Amino acid sequence: DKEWILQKIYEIMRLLDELXDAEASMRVSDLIYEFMKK
Amino acid sequence: DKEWILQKIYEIMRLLDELXDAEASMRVSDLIYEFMKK
Amino acid sequence: ASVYAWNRKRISNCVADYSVLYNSASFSTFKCYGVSPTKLNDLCFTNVYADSFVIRGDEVRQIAPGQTGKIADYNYKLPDDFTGCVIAWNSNNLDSKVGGNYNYLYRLFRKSNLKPFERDISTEIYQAGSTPCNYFPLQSYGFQPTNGVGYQPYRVVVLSFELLHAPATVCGPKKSTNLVKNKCVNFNFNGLTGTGVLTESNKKFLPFQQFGRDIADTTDAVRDPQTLEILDITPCSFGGV
Amino acid sequence: PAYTNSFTRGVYYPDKVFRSSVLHSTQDLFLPFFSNVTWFHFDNPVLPFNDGVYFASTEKSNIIRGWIFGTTLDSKTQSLLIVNNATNVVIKVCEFQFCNDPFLMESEFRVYSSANNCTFEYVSQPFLMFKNLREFVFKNIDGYFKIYSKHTPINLVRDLPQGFSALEPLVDLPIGINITRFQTLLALHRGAAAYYVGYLQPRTFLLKYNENGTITDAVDCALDPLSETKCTLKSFTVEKGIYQTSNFRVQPTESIVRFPNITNLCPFGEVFNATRF
Ligand SMILES: *[C@@H]1O[C@H](CO)[C@@H](O)[C@H](O)[C@H]1NC(C)=O
Ligand SMILES: *[C@@H]1O[C@H](CO)[C@@H](O)[C@H](O)[C@H]1NC(C)=O
Ligand SMILES: *[C@@H]1O[C@H](CO)[C@@H](O)[C@H](O)[C@H]1NC(C)=O
Ligand SMILES: *[C@@H]1O[C@H](CO)[C@@H](O)[C@H](O)[C@H]1NC(C)=O
Ligand SMILES: *[C@@H]1O[C@H](CO)[C@@H](O)[C@H](O)[C@H]1NC(C)=O
Ligand SMILES: *[C@@H]1O[C@H](CO)[C@@H](O)[C@H](O)[C@H]1NC(C)=O
């Protein structure tokens, strides 16, 4: 699951990167770094 | 663990709903669904 | 009637065309089981309950017996041994609004699976545990008229073809074929059949007499189903050389 | 008990076929000629349907405007009701409850207990609003609902007439629900009428068709021997003579059985009445 969930949530942060909103994209990526930490 | 991170992701896509993308938040919701079922 | 507002609404004692739908191409994802499509326009029953809902264009590809996109895992689920059809098409033409049509919330995830024909209809605010996070993760659709391919709110219908011990197989007629006279034929009326030359028929029936026989149970006088008019039957030339 | 004889009313075209000036027997459900029928005007309680019925009216009245049937006669099992309202008739599978007095210048639908959980409507044109008589019969076969009727003149205010008529189908209904009792459709006016009910049986009849194809009159062949013969020679004109018609078996009574004298043995209880184990 980890590979797939990580791939998909990085796709999410990529999408919300494309649609200008830095704080929320960076927050989702902080949760992904949590997956790195958890 | 709990769905706290899931809830915050919902909050993110709903703030984007309040922004006015009406597609991006939908994608985020789809992927939230994907994680809950995963 | 959306996918947590399903209504098993009633259709019976009525003959509904089904094949005119195919050449119409109003639906766009025709697929079904339990019967050949080109054969349902011939045999069917009572119990024609249906549904018409709104679905995100993605999940449609899995509407099936036992298989179902886990979106409608709660919203709508089917069993196997389902004698009917399930057809669908697009609705992003008007059933979508700027900012997304949050007017509909779709259910997400329960502590237990759902079995078909029964659902859970009351507001769901996801519980992180025994109690929710003590806020709401419940989700509603959003449909901008400029939505994506896999997210067109689609148009969807489900059909039921089963029979209790009641009467009334209410199914398509035979389109009606033009009659012939003065030529021996393997004619076949509404269940009645035989052979012979149909011709004039002076004998005057009464308004409630399908067909006629004279004696020894020989079939010789049929009211045509079309115009109530009266037709004769006569096993025509035959014998031995 | 307000009985009265059923003289000759009570036939009905057994089937939607035509024949031309022939004789034709058939076995179906009818009523015995010269059988009993009950009536009344104070109030008419429920009567049990029991496998086909036959109904009539009085003159100079319409207070009775239909019938209601079923088995348990409540919301448990689907029921039915037949009335008109002077311009468009109604037929339901609607779940109205048998009140203490299911009835209706006008108190429309005052019978109505509950219109809940109803599955089939039916609307159409009417049959009837020193006058006519009501000649109707009802039967339930092959999971079907039936109807047979006609609208004929009537005089002689006292009671039923003589003479003989055919009957007619109205239209068949694929309802299929269960029925084992029923109840008249009457009303209170804030009056003196005649309903008539007789049961049915599987007897075999001998039907004569006129020139055109209308049932003039038939003859049952269980009443008396004269009739019986008429259906074992296939006519109405028995030439002088003698004919054996049928047979008869004087049945037994009680089916006795005998078997050996004592028939009691095999010590069985002392094993259970034993001491220890
Ligand atoms: C019919 O009723 C009369 C009295 O009303 C009675 O004398 C007679 O025995 C009854 N016969 C039958 C067959 O019901
Ligand atoms: C209506 O009656 C049917 C009888 O077949 C029953 O199955 C159903 O539960 C009833 N529903 C309501 C709402 O009364
Ligand atoms: C009810 O209907 C069933 C079949 O439809 C039949 O077997 C039964 O005898 C009927 N009557 C009662 C009282 O159940
Ligand atoms: C038989 O039908 C003809 C024409 O329909 C009619 O004139 C004649 O009266 C009918 N027969 C009798 C006995 O009424
Ligand atoms: C056995 O048969 C004898 C013959 O006379 C009779 O007297 C006696 O009652 C019978 N016993 C029983 C138990 O029937
Ligand atoms: C035991 O004996 C009693 C009488 O003392 C008798 O009624 C009973 O039948 C016997 N037990 C069984 C199991 O029959």
Residue numbers in the entry:
A (entry chain E), B (entry chain D): 1 to 38
C (entry chain A): 348 to 481, 489 to 595
D (entry chain C): 26 to 66, 79 to 141, 153 to 177, 186 to 246, 261 to 347
Please give the exact wording used by the authors of the publication that reports this structure.
Here, we demonstrate a strategy for designing dimeric helix-hairpin motifs from a previously reported three-helix-bundle miniprotein that targets the receptor-binding domain (RBD) of severe acute respiratory syndrome-coronavirus-2 (SARS-CoV-2). The dimeric four-helix bundle competes with the human angiotensin-converting enzyme 2 (ACE2) in binding to RBD with 2:2 stoichiometry.
To investigate the structure of dimeric SIH-5 bound to RBD and its consequence on the spike protein, we resorted to electron microscopy at physiological pH where 68% of the spike protein are present in an 1-RBD up conformation. The three-dimensional (3D) classification indicated that most particles adopt a dimeric state. To identify the interacting residues between SIH-5 and spike protein, we improved the resolution of the single spike protein trimer bound to SIH-5, which was solved at a resolution range of 3.5–4.5 Å using a local resolution calculation and a global resolution of 4.47 Å at 0.143 Fourier shell correlation. The side chains of the S2 region in spike protein are visible in high-resolution maps, which allowed us to calculate the atomic model from the cryo-EM map. The SIH-5 fit with high accuracy within the additional density present between the RBDs of either spike protein. The fitting of SIH-5 revealed an antiparallel four-helix bundle formed by the two helix-hairpin protomers, where both the loops are at one end and the N and C termini at the other. The total interacting surface area of SIH-5 with RBD is 944 Å2.
